[PDB]
Structures are given as C-alpha cells and as structure tokens.
Amino acid sequence: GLFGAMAGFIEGGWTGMIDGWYGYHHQNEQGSGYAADQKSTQNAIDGITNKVNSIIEKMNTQFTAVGKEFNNLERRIENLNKKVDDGFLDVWTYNAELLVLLENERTLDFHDSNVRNLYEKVKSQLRNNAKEIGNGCFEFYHKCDDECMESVKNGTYDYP
Amino acid sequence: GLFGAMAGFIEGGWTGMIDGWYGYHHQNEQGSGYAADQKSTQNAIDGITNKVNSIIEKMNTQFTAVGKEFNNLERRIENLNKKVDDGFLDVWTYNAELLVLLENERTLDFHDSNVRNLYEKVKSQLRNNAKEIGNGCFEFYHKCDDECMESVKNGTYDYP
Amino acid sequence: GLFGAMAGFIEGGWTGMIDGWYGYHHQNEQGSGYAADQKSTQNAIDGITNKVNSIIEKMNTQFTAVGKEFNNLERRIENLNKKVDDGFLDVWTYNAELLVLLENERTLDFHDSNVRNLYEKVKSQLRNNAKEIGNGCFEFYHKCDDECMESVKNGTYDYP
Amino acid sequence: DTICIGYHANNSTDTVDTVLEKNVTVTHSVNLLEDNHNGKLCKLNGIAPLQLGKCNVAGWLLGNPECDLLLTANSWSYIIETSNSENGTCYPGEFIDYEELREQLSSVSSFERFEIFPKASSWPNHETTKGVTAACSYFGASSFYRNLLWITKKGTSYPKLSKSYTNNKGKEVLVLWGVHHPPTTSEQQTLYQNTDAYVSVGSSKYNRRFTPEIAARPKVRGQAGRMNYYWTLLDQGDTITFEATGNLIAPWYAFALNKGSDSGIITSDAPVHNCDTKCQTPHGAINSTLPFQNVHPITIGECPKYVKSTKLRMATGLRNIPSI
Amino acid sequence: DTICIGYHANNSTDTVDTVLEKNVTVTHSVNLLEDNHNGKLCKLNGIAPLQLGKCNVAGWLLGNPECDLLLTANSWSYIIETSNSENGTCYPGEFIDYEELREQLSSVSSFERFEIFPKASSWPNHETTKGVTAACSYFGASSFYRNLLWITKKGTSYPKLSKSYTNNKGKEVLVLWGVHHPPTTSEQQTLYQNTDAYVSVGSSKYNRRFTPEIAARPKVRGQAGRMNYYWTLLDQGDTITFEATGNLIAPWYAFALNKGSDSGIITSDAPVHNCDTKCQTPHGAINSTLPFQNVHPITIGECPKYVKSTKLRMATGLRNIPSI
Amino acid sequence: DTICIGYHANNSTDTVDTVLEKNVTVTHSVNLLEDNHNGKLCKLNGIAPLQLGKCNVAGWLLGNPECDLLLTANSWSYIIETSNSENGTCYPGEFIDYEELREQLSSVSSFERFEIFPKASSWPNHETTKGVTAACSYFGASSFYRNLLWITKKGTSYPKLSKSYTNNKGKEVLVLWGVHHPPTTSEQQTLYQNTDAYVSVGSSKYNRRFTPEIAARPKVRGQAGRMNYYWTLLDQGDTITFEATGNLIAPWYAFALNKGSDSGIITSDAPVHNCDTKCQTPHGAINSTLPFQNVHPITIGECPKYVKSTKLRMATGLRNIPSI
Ligand SMILES: CC(=O)N[C@H]1[C@H]([C@H](O)[C@H](O)CO)O[C@@](O[C@H]2[C@@H](O)[C@@H](CO)O[C@@H](O[C@H]3[C@H](O)[C@@H](O)[C@@H](O)O[C@@H]3CO)[C@@H]2O)(C(=O)O)C[C@@H]1O
Ligand SMILES: CC(=O)N[C@H]1[C@H]([C@H](O)[C@H](O)CO)O[C@@](O[C@H]2[C@@H](O)[C@@H](CO)O[C@@H](O[C@H]3[C@H](O)[C@@H](O)[C@@H](O)O[C@@H]3CO)[C@@H]2O)(C(=O)O)C[C@@H]1O
C-alpha cells in the first residue's frame, strides 16, 4: 500500500500462517512451515486494540431525551428544535463516515508498514548471505538449519 | 516528503511527461523520452477520485430554512437560535478547514509514496546491472535498447 | 515507528545532541561529538510550528453568552437549550480528543520519517565506502577526518 | 534454503471502505454502528416505565373514566403512549401548558395520589352530585374525571365558595383543576346562577383569575361547552387558595410527587417486558457500547449519536488476500 | 544508457494549504467551497416563489389596498420580501402570532382565495359600507383591507350578530379577522353602541373571547385607534362561529390552502428570473454539489454547510516543480 | 572512523497520548487545553461589569430600598449577581417577562436614570405620599421602590388620571411600572375607590389594558396583596400614555439607555478586580489563545470551546528515549 509490502512486493496472504498477523515461512532440508513474528504481532494488536477503544471510549454522552412536543402555535421553535436534531445528526453522520474511512486507511497502512519493517529487519541481518527474490523471500547463500532459521526469526543471526 | 521522493532525492518535476503523474525517462543510443507508468498512475487517479467523492458524497443535507423571525419579546430564543447557527457554522468551519489541511497532507504524501514505490520497483529489478545516481536515475552497466527499456518499464527485465 | 527509525533500528535518543532534533555523531582519530542536521531540523520546526498554529488559528469564535434563564413554564426550551449546549460540547470533546490522538500519531511518525530520510540520505552517499551496523551507524572503510566528516554532514561526500 | 516474511490471510469476507478504495476485504473487522434492538420497551436504569395504553397523559392525570387502571401509577423512568392513546380530555377543552406538563412529569421518583379536596363535605351548600357528562361516560352511564369535581349551583343559589390547601406532604404537589365555559350566557346561569362568575386561584406563586368565556361554538364529542384544564406545582409549605362564584371544576384528587431528573415520553406499540437498559427507543432497547446508532433519531437515556449511516465498519486486521 | 523514474509537472499555479506548509503549488486541485451565485432569485425545486414587492406578508394576507396585484397568488415554494416591503397593516395594531403565521405559510401547494362571509347580505341590519379609513387609503380615497370587512353599528343600534362557516373545501382554511380597539370609550359607543361589547370566535379548536381594550394611546399613521389581527387554520369539516356585539372586523375573504412541507421567507432585491435550484439564498442561487458554501449563512433548501472560509481547495495532483 | 545519524533526547517528562499508545514521553509538547483562571471577575473588552451584590436585577431596576448604592450604575459589559442577590421585588408579585428583560439589559453602552413622572406635582388630586409598605422597609421604617410611585385614592375619590411621556432622549427609554392586585375587592375600594378600576398603557407599539385581579391568596413576606411589574422599551420620538382609575404603580424614574450588542449575566462570588479579558467565566477570567477550555461550560465573550477533557496535550518534539 503506502509502504509497498501488502498487495505489493509481497502480493499474497498466507492462509497457512494461523498464529499471528505478520510472520515467516522457512524452507530448508529439514522441513518447512509458518511462524508468526510474535513481537510485531502483539504490538500491532495492542495498538489496534487501543485505537478501537479510543474511538469508542472518547464518545461522551449524557442522559437525554431528544423528543420535544410543541403545539400548533410553536412551529418556529419546533423547527428550531428540528434544525438542532438534523444539525447534530448531520455532523455525526459526516464524522463517523469519514473517521472510519480515514482510520481504515491508516490501519491498513499500519499493517503494510509493519510488514515492510519486518522484511527489512531481516533483509538487514542476512545482507549478502542471501539473495532477494522480489516476492518477500530470501534464499540463503548457505545452509540454514532450524537453529539458523530460528536465529533470524528472533533477530540473532550470526556473522553476515 | 514523508517518503523522500518528491522534492527529495528526485528534486524536480518533469514538465516533459504529459501522459501521467508518475513515470520514466530513458536515455540510450537510439533516442530518449518520457513514458508515464500507466498502472501506478491510473490507480492513483482512481484513489484520489474516490477520495474526492467521499468528502463530497458523505455530506448529508435535508431541505432546510435557516432563518427564523422572532419578535422583540423573544430575544432569549432568538439568541438560542443564534447560538445554534453560529454553533454549527463554527463546527463546519473548523472541520472543513482542517479536513482539507490534513487530507492535503495525505494526498501529497500518497503521491510521494507512489514515486518511491515505483523507483524501488525498478531499483529492485536492475540490482547490480546499474548504478544508482541519487537523482532518481539508474545508469545501466550494459546496453539497454528500446526492448530492454521497455521490459523494465513493464516490470519484466531479464537476468539481473 | 511507522518508518522504523525511532525506537526502531536506531533504538535510542541522544541526550548529548542539544542543538537540534535530528543529527549526527561522528567518531574518528581526531575526536568525536554530536552535530544537529540544521536543515532537516529547521524544516521540521517550521512544519510543526505551522501545524500547531493551524490547529489554533483555525478555531473561529464570536462573542457569545452561553447562559440563558428560563422560567418554570419553559422547561421544554430550557431543555432544548440544554440539548444544544450538551450537544456542541459533546462534539468539541470528541473532536479535540481525537484530533490530538491522530495528530500526535502523525507528528511522531513525521519525526521518525525525518530520521529515516536523513539516515538514508547518508547511506546513499557512503554506498560501499562504509559498512552498515544496524544501530544507525556507518563505519567507513577508510579514514574520515573532520573535513570528510563535514562533507557527509553537508551532503558533499566525495568519490564513493 | 529460504525464508520469507509475509502476512496473515483467512476465510473472512468482511469488507470495509477506505479513503481510496471501496469494499476492501479484511481479515478482521469491528463494527462501530449499533443497528439492532430487542424490539421491547425496557426499564431505563432499572426502573420500569409507565404504560398508559388507551389513555394519554391528559386522561391519566385528569382521571378519565377509561383510565381507572392507571389510578395506582408508581415511580416510572419514562412514560409510554400507544397508537391507541386517544382517551384524554373526554370533555372538550384546552389543556393549558399541556406539553410543558408532559415534559415535567416524564420522570418521577415517588408519586402519591391523595384526596386534596374531599368530595364528601368540602363544598356544603353546593351541588357536588350532578357533575357528570355523556362525553365522559363510564360503561354506558354518564360520568366524569376521577380527580376533578364538577361543582354546580345548589337549588337556585351559587354562593361564593372558598377553600385552601397547604402542602405538608414534604414534596411538590401537582394540583389540577378546570374552568367550565358554557356556550351561552343562558347556561352560565342555569348552572352557576351568577352571570358574572369568576374563579380565582391563589398561591405564593400564582394569581391568574378566570371568568367564563361564553361563546357560540361547535359541539365536540357531544357538548358545545368547554373545559380548560389547568395545573401548578405547589411548593412545600405553600398554600393554594381557590374561591369562585361559578364555573369551577375543583381539584378532587391531587398528586404528591418527587421529581429529580427529567426524561421523556416514548410512543410505541412494542411490548413492555422486564429488561434493563441505559438507552431506550420506540422500536426497542439499543446498546450503549458503540459510538453510533441508526435505529431511531428519537431516544431516551445515554445513547450512541444517531447517524444516517447503514455501515460503519472499522478494520482491525489487514487486507485479506488468500489463495494457495 | 540510463532510465530515470520521476513525476509530472506543468504550468499550474493553483496552491493548496497543508498541515505543514502554507501555499504549496500543485499540478491539479479541486475546489470544495462553493462561493459563486447567479445573483438571481430562482425556483426552488421547480416551483417559483411568491413576490410581494412593496407589500409584506401582513399586507398581502389582510388585503392592504396596495397589494391588489397579489390577489391572485398561487402555489410558490418560498416567499420573497423586498427592502421595499413596508405595506402591511395600514391601520395600526398588533398582528397576533405574526411570525408564526409567516413561518407556517412559507410553503404552499394549492392556495385559493374565496369569499367566506359575503359583504353583500351577510350582516343585514348592520352597517357594512362605512368600514373605511384614511390610513388604508386607495388612490387618494379612504379604503380598507380587501379580505376583512369593517362592520359598524346600524342607525343607532348594534344588534348581536352571529355567523358560522364550515370547512367543506377539503383542506385547511386560513381564516383571518380583527378586533378594533377605540382610543376612548366615547368612540366605542359612537361606532358600536354597546359600551361593553365583545367578540367571540368559536371552533372545535378555538374559544378565545375578546373585549374592546379602550385606552388613550398615540396616533399612528393617522388613527389613535387600533386593530389586532388574528388568524386560525380551520380543519376540514370543522366549523368556526363568530358572534359579536361590536368591535368585530369580520373575515370577508379567507384562503383554502394546502400545506405539505415548510420552507421560509427570503428577503432580497435580486431579480426573480425563471431558473431552477435545490438551494437558494438572498444573493442568488447557490450550487448544491460541494460540501461547503460561504455565500450566505441564511439559505433555503438542501444546502452546503455555511462556513466562514474563503478557501477550501483540495489537492488531487502532486507538488508542482517545473523548470528544465 | 564512524558516523551515526540519530535523534534528540532530554530530561522532559511531558507525556501525550496517541491513537496507538497511551502516555508516550515526548521531548517537547504544547498544551491546547486552557484550564487555569485568575479567580477574578474582570472587564470584558475593557469595560467593567455591573455589581449588584445583595440586589438582583429586579431589585436594581425597580429601586428596592436595599439597592440605593446601585442608583448610579453606568455602562457595564455584563452583569454580576451574587449568591447573596436576593433583594429584588420586596413587595410580592410577578415580574412579567423578567428573563427577557435580564437578557436585553445584559449589555449597555450609556444608561441614564431620569425622573419621567415627577412625584412632586404630577398626580395632583391624588395621594402620592402613602405609597409605602412594610415588605419594602428601609432601615426599620416602611418604604417602597425608588423608581415607582404608589399612587392611592385621594380623600375618598380616585379620579381617572392620565399622563403621557415622549421619548426625546434620543435613545431607547426603559419604562417600568406595576399594577397592584388587592387580595379582596374590599381593599380594592378602601385604596382605589373604584371597584372596577383599570390601568391602560398606550404607545405606538403597546396597548395591553389591565384590571385588578382580586383573589384570596397567601401572604408573602407580609402582604397578601400582589404587584405585577411591567416594562417596555420606548422608541425615540414615541409617546407612552398612562391612564388609570386605580391600581396603578406609576413609573417615577425611568432609564434612558443605549444598547448596541448583547452579552449576559454572570452569577459568582469571585472578587471584581481591575483586569481585562476577551472571555470571562463565573470562576474567573479565562485565556482566549487556546482552542479549548474546561474551566466552565458557561462563559461570556469570545471563548475556547468548552470540553469535558482534562488533558489535550499535543506533541511537537519526538519520543523521548534518553539513557547513556
Ligand atoms: C350540568 C351538568 O351537570 N352536566 C350536564 C351537561 C352540561 O349541562 C353541559 O356540558 C354544560 O356545558 O350537559 C349534558 O348534556 C346535555 C347538554 O349538552 C344539553 C345542552 O344544553 O343538551 C342535552 O341534550 C338535549 C339535546 O341537545 C336536544 O336536541 C334534545 O334531545 O334534548 C336533549 C336533552 O336536553 C344534553 O343531554 C352532558 O352530558 O354534558 C348533560 C349533563 O347532565
Ligand atoms: C368609523 C369608520 O368607519 N371609520 C372612520 C375612522 C374610525 O372612526 C376610527 O379609525 C376609529 O378608531 O376614523 C377616520 O378618521 C377620523 C377619526 O380619526 C377621527 C377621530 O375620532 O378624527 C377625524 O379627523 C378629525 C381631526 O382629528 C380633527 O382635528 C378635525 O380636523 O376634524 C377631523 C374630522 O373629524 C378623522 O377623519 C379614519 O380614517 O379612520 C374616518 C373613518 O371614516
């Protein structure tokens, strides 16, 4: 999206990764599989969770009865009351509508950004010890058993 | 801007590219010229077009007559009506004003982001087969005729 | 954050850099120290300064007396007036609250983005003449006296 | 050997809208728009409402013969009128400041109906047994409101009456009364004798004096005569004094109530079941968790801002792009 | 051989403001603030307004002799008063609930002016040919409103009159009338004889009774006497009854109208041409495409929220940085 | 040799909230919520307010004997009532359209108190020296308002009085007056003789006629009688005429004022010091620099939108992450 990762240089989602939002998928002589990057996932959950609460928690409301009842000689204020009701409800309708649109954009970008950062966190460690195949993958110029695969997952990949 | 491309590492605009927002400019032994990247341009248009509609389409309004008319012994409600009119018009003035400011920021960033992604899409294909001259250009370490120039434009550049 | 620099690949702040927001810290045989990148700092100040004014300057307000006074047989409009007061104050409370939340996010991202751009501006000049140590530092593959350190600071680093 | 960094995907089909794209499938979303209700009229903050049914507020307070089931009313957080609440002022006339009263009585903590001016010996030397009409007929028979008493001339003399009441109930007292207006000054005399009668109501905070407003007018649900209904809230320790030489529809039963905060009147035919809620509407109870509601512009309680939206879904997960 | 990736630039000079920078030149922008108008008073939703010109609403409805051109009024979506609309109640007095009436008649589907109480034989044994004044002078001559009739004492006797009207027009009927108030109880008699006269107006929904309010007061545009103008909307099938022993300014012509939805009254001197529109203002027609308008706080129709902004330009293209 | 690019950090502990994280320490922040005040009642735009102290608006205008210090009032941008402003209508009664008057007089440019109807020879052949009551007692003695005059029957005859006044002050004139209502028609005569008296007030824009509304009512702060207070703004060049056969509490002193724009009435016990301000509140002066305020929902002037927030801190610097 804004950061190129989702539906970008990493064009597809992993139906097989079922324990997180962002993660890896290794492939070596011993086997293969997915593993969600736990730290970036939790942090992403905490943030979104916090974002959703904000949008909700920040809505103040007091006890109120909107209805009014005015007789046939109070059209002026009945209409004034109408202007108020239509009025606020025209404000909350434009705000809710846009708040979601804009925040939805932000959220998706946030995810995209988290992926790019993850991809980059790894692209940093491997350096020349791997070639980049523009699909979000790295092919090691050496053997990388499960310990090795692990080290890069928990960002502790040796001499690069 | 936020992504470095516009007025950044690619400091100028191409008055010569007149068929799109983002594109290329090749230079080889056969000739030179500009070519707008059609996919990223269309997509950018669709999005902005959609963004503009949203900001407009999302504005609900019902038939209304703002004026009121109150006699000299209805100052209290005439003022109440005043508070309402000034009131909403103080809300829409602060909102329109800021909505534009913030959305304008977003739009410009979006363009900047699209350029960086494009530049990067290419920087990815060429790899070592070209040197990066920090002005948004790539000088091939080999000959790149129009077929070649084409391949990179439509992202199908051979062995790199 | 969104751009990886702050509390990211450059995990800490420089208590020692006291003349700007973003800058450098060199280390060579002659000495060491911090130097704020003046251009990116000023520009960042101007922008934030402008952002703060906007949020303030854009608040229109006319002379007004909120209070009203209605007798015991004007409960209906006293409540109407109440709906208006609670009403607007429910709008400004949700807006201020969120405007800050969202703008605070934007501001922090902006700083993070400025750092990444700076880091990248340099990472561009040095190229192979230095190795990247994923902590926001570059170790030259050669000697870099104060002139040299200077050149990269004011983006005029020679043959790379 | 290889390692790829990527993102999640699933069978989700939830879609959200963004500034740039319409309908984007997402892995996880959350709804911010409450658009469901239990189609029931609940208790607002643990306090059942007041059902009037066939009766409307005027009929309930005045004592319309069709609201006998409402003579025990007690507490209530909001009032419920039905599409069948048409039984109010059986005897034609104007209920002065009616809306205002409806508004003020929307919510009541305690509410006791007492006999302020006992029919039995309260107006001796005055006819208190003929105050009945066909408009306010109870089971075929002619009747009258149950909280007001239609005092009429005794024999052929209508002596000036006088009666006071002091609020010692230790709380506001709602005192209702009426003034009858004959269609002709010929009736003004065959009923109240004095063809220049007046009805005055005094209080430390009241003094409006009345006179019969005779006038040839159309007959409504029978009678061509009219009755204007009045009311006032008598403060603790204050005394309300009535004196009249005719046309007085004296208070018989008044109410000693306790208003704290005000709510409103819901008009709906939804069933009233025993459920609780913070925000109530005409179609039913609404949830107060989400910031927005689109169930009904008219609500009572602490409610989610009413919006003309049909969809306010917020993304939480990322774009959903499956396929293996 | 080289290839550069870059961005567009042109001769554009449009500038937009952003959170961080003021006036940023952009390649392409779009305006969201409508600030132009056709300086004309159009038709609101395909229905021309009602021009009163020199006359104001009161003069139009009452029948001021200077509003003879307005006796054919028909339909209209909103009313237009001019800076020259000063011809209303030529005869001094208070137009009861005037604003309220203006508001209610802002919009009318059908509107027919009919003779409710024919001047010719309707008040026999009553003088109906002297009801004329210098304040309401028509072409130098003394005259009176065209929809009301000034009934005055016959010979030296003013017998109690009575007259009813039932709405069989199949739609609301606007019934206007007045009550004259002499400056002295000496005139009350030389005009209506009975120095204790009254005017009562009855309806299934009306009963306000009147008496002459004699009082020494300043002379306004001639007369020291006064005339309060009243009105009421008579529901289909209902009957309005008038009876009076003096001071009655009887309804002569009433209006059978059809209100559906309410709009308002525009006061402006802009020309009224045949154009259409959804949103109209005092300065002219405004467009309803953009979310905001800064042409006028006071509008009628479906309008763009009024803002104190002068510039709300939104970027669509990117920063414009030309130069070769 | 090495070079690192990094960011600033300091001893700051200011924290701001973001969409994703609560309490984030920042190097530099700015507050957008004004929540402090000088706990003083200032001048609104360089024009001191009007202090009533023990007196409320009614007592000040009528001339309650306890508001003698307020007889020099001049200019003021807003009015101040205290928790001790209980001295108003010492003599029981209803102040007609009181709120409305309070609202209209909230702000006044010029304001001069003059003798409109001189007590000394203005009502000859009428008793103007007994108009005194125990309710309006001045220093133990019985007194009365200082701007109204209680005219009472002379000897045993109360001849019809008449008096006019033309506004030649070149500005609106506030004319206050009252009508006394005895508790019994027995007193109506021992005071005004005519047991059918009336009080009429005429103006080119006024005509409301009054009659005594006798009625047995409770005694308030002594008297069982009542006095309704009325008022009107007399336009330049217009004439107000009073005539009455009893019950008139004639205007003695009126006010020639100059209203331009309207403000309001602050009720607070905060000290009134000489300070200026654009926005004022009951707790004190508030600053008008920030977009938001949480000091008080009720304000007067050009104020920062009131919010229920406690913290609206905006980041300017970046995340603060020190430690060497
Ligand atoms: C006085 C009393 O206690 N209630 C009677 C009322 C009141 O007199 C009336 O509401 C005062 O405004 O009237 C009741 O109905 C009778 C009354 O309407 C009279 C009209 O004065 O007409 C009677 O019916 C007539 C009918 O109109 C004639 O055409 C003919 O049929 O004779 C009958 C009998 O007179 C009404 O019965 C009422 O119900 O309110 C009777 C109450 O007792
Ligand atoms: C009664 C009728 O049909 N209309 C006449 C009205 C009404 O009497 C009046 O409005 C009731 O309030 O009065 C008209 O004008 C005359 C009237 O104002 C009388 C005052 O009672 O004065 C006449 O003018 C006087 C003038 O004031 C004297 O100084 C002197 O010049 O004599 C003349 C003649 O009497 C008014 O002409 C009116 O136009 O409304 C006459 C209507 O016929």
Ligand SMILES: CC(=O)N[C@H]1[C@H]([C@H](O)[C@H](O)CO)O[C@@](O[C@H]2[C@@H](O)[C@@H](CO)O[C@@H](O[C@H]3[C@H](O)[C@@H](O)[C@@H](O)O[C@@H]3CO)[C@@H]2O)(C(=O)O)C[C@@H]1O
């Ligand atoms: C008329 C005048 O100038 N003011 C007197 C007023 C007015 O008469 C009164 O307000 C009209 O509504 O009355 C003053 O107080 C006396 C008055 O209230 C009368 C009642 O009519 O009672 C007197 O007290 C009585 C008391 O009630 C008896 O129980 C017994 O003690 O005798 C005394 C003396 O009559 C009040 O003094 C007033 O202060 O307003 C007197 C004014 O002069």
Ligand SMILES: *[C@@H]1O[C@H](CO)[C@@H](O[C@H]2O[C@H](CO)[C@@H](O)[C@H](O)[C@H]2NC(C)=O)[C@H](O)[C@H]1NC(C)=O
């Ligand atoms: C109770 O309400 C009913 C109507 O809701 C009143 O009766 C009226 O309704 C009838 C149809 O059900 C109509 O035919 C009449 O208008 C009228 N019927 C009668 C009784 O004359 C009924 O009067 C109300 N109860 C009272 C007496 O107030």
Ligand SMILES: *[C@@H]1O[C@H](CO)[C@@H](O[C@H]2O[C@H](CO)[C@@H](O)[C@H](O)[C@H]2NC(C)=O)[C@H](O)[C@H]1NC(C)=O
């Ligand atoms: C029609 O309106 C005009 C004013 O708009 C009325 O005439 C008045 O205006 C004159 C100036 O044009 C002033 O000199 C007077 O106040 C007055 N003139 C007259 C006729 O006395 C005019 O009366 C209105 N028509 C009527 C009779 O209602």
Ligand SMILES: *[C@@H]1O[C@H](CO)[C@@H](O[C@H]2O[C@H](CO)[C@@H](O)[C@H](O)[C@H]2NC(C)=O)[C@H](O)[C@H]1NC(C)=O
């Ligand atoms: C001035 O105000 C005071 C009260 O604020 C009036 O006096 C009343 O207050 C007393 C307590 O201070 C009570 O005991 C009484 O209700 C009453 N006292 C008197 C004087 O009877 C006082 O009357 C006001 N001044 C006037 C005369 O209007």
Ligand SMILES: *[C@@H]1O[C@H](CO)[C@@H](O)[C@H](O)[C@H]1NC(C)=O
């Ligand atoms: C969607 O997938 C989840 C996880 O496997 C499963 O629980 C659910 O039943 C599935 N529903 C559908 C749409 O098949």
Ligand SMILES: *[C@@H]1O[C@H](CO)[C@@H](O)[C@H](O)[C@H]1NC(C)=O
């Ligand atoms: C999904 O696609 C478009 C969005 O504009 C529309 O035609 C359709 O109704 C949408 N339905 C959903 C998923 O709400």
Ligand SMILES: *[C@@H]1O[C@H](CO)[C@@H](O)[C@H](O)[C@H]1NC(C)=O
């Ligand atoms: C701007 O450029 C466009 C495209 O060449 C052209 O149509 C237009 O006339 C130009 N206008 C100016 C400002 O010269």
Ligand SMILES: *[C@@H]1O[C@H](CO)[C@@H](O)[C@H](O)[C@H]1NC(C)=O
């Ligand atoms: C452009 O530059 C500044 C913006 O603040 C201002 O002086 C000038 O009026 C602006 N004019 C435009 C292009 O609206």
Ligand SMILES: *[C@@H]1O[C@H](CO)[C@@H](O)[C@H](O)[C@H]1NC(C)=O
């Ligand atoms: C914070 O640091 C600044 C700069 O050194 C200094 O002026 C101030 O006194 C310090 N305050 C604290 C919290 O010690």
Ligand SMILES: *[C@@H]1O[C@H](CO)[C@@H](O)[C@H](O)[C@H]1NC(C)=O
């Ligand atoms: C800081 O941390 C949390 C924020 O939610 C809270 O417990 C505490 O009160 C906050 N205090 C500050 C710095 O305002």
